[PDB]
Structure formats: C-alpha cells, structure tokens
Scaffold this active site. Sequence first.
Site, PDB file in Angstrom:
ATOM      1  N   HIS A 252       0.811  -1.241   0.000  1.00 25.86           N
ATOM      2  CA  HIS A 252       0.000   0.000   0.000  1.00 25.86           C
ATOM      3  C   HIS A 252       0.852   1.304   0.000  1.00 25.86           C
ATOM      4  CE1 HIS A 252       0.261  -1.029   4.331  1.00 25.86           C
ATOM      5  NE2 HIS A 252       0.395   0.283   4.474  1.00 25.86           N
TER       6      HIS A 252
ATOM      7  N   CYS B  47       4.066   1.522   8.970  1.00 26.83           N
ATOM      8  CA  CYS B  47       3.997   0.507   7.905  1.00 26.83           C
ATOM      9  C   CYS B  47       5.357   0.468   7.236  1.00 26.83           C
ATOM     10  CB  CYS B  47       2.920   0.829   6.859  1.00 26.83           C
ATOM     11  SG  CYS B  47       1.261   0.710   7.481  1.00 26.83           S
TER      12      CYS B  47
ATOM     13  N   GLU C 237       0.823  -8.636   0.249  1.00 22.01           N
ATOM     14  CA  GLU C 237       0.974  -7.264   0.729  1.00 22.01           C
ATOM     15  C   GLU C 237       2.447  -6.742   0.737  1.00 22.01           C
ATOM     16  OE1 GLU C 237      -1.619  -5.527   0.620  1.00 22.01           O
ATOM     17  OE2 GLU C 237      -1.013  -3.704   1.608  1.00 22.01           O
TER      18      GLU C 237
ATOM     19  N   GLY D  54       1.737   5.431  10.144  1.00 20.65           N
ATOM     20  CA  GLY D  54       3.103   5.792   9.961  1.00 20.65           C
ATOM     21  C   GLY D  54       4.098   4.661  10.288  1.00 20.65           C
TER      22      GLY D  54
END
Length: 181
Positions: free
Chosen positions: A41, A148, A72, A146
Amino acid sequence: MGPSLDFALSLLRRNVRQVQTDQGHFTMLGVRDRLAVLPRHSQPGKTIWIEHKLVNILDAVELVDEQGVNLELTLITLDTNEKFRDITKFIPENISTASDATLVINTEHMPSMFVPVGDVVQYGFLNLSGKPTHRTMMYNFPTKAGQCGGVVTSVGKVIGIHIGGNGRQGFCAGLKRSYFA
C-alpha cells in the site's frame, strides 16, 4: 553494547531506510544488491524518495501466493550505486513466529524508532482495506499510522514487515528467504 541492540542498530544503519511515496512516509528494507521490499500500500511509482534523494525504480513486483492471493509486499529494484548489505541469511526460510520481537521503524516522522511489540504469532488470513491477505503474523501491540514497512526483528532474525493494525493489534507480512532469491 549488547548483541540485540547492536543487530537492530546495524540494521538501521545498513538496511532500513526512510522513504516517501505519493502515499506518504514508510520504512523500506533493503535486502541485498539493489533489491528492497515495501508494503504494497505504499504504491511506489517510477521514482522514490529515499532519505535525501529521488531514486529510480527499475522494477516493481507485488507478491502473490500460489492462489494469486496478495501477500501485501512489493519488491523493488533500484537504480543506485549502493549495494545493500546482504541480510537474506537473517530471513527465515519459512514464515516464523517469534518471542518478544522488536519493531524497528525509520521514517522522517519516526526516525530510528524501536517498538517492543512482544510475541509475534501465526495469523494467516487478513482483510486489509478490502484487500485479502495471506501469510500474515500478529502482535498484541496497539500499532499506529506511519509504522507501515517497519521491520519485525528478534534474535538476529528479520521475520516481517509491518502491514497494518486495528488500534489494539499489529500485523506484519511474514518474510521468507525465497522471496529474495
């Protein structure tokens, strides 16, 4: 200085970079050579800001498992003179749980940040913003926005990349060595 503090500090120095994409600030892990890994993402584009300059991305691969289910993780190959210290040997061959793990974050907003997440456990399936995700692991620590891309580490092993959270729990995408072969 102790072995654990040394290992994670050396990870920050050699391998864990502050980045910005159009989606905001993330932690990036450089794995070996010109190969790094980002949370999917983060959506890297054709270029990425790493610490103090724009770096071109030669290739981006958003990893799926054998059923075509999202993992992911995005693998990027950078146009850089830097070769990352190879840490693929600290990545388990199979997705491994841990005890009393640390989450090492490094962003412009959260530089060189160490978060004791505790135990990392098998989770498997997760729905991440209408995106369904396999090979996840979970920790009972109220992670925040914040973090990730943060790197899940324990006893000289790099086992995951922080992927999201729900206000009481954190979730990482499990790392395995074969992603970086």
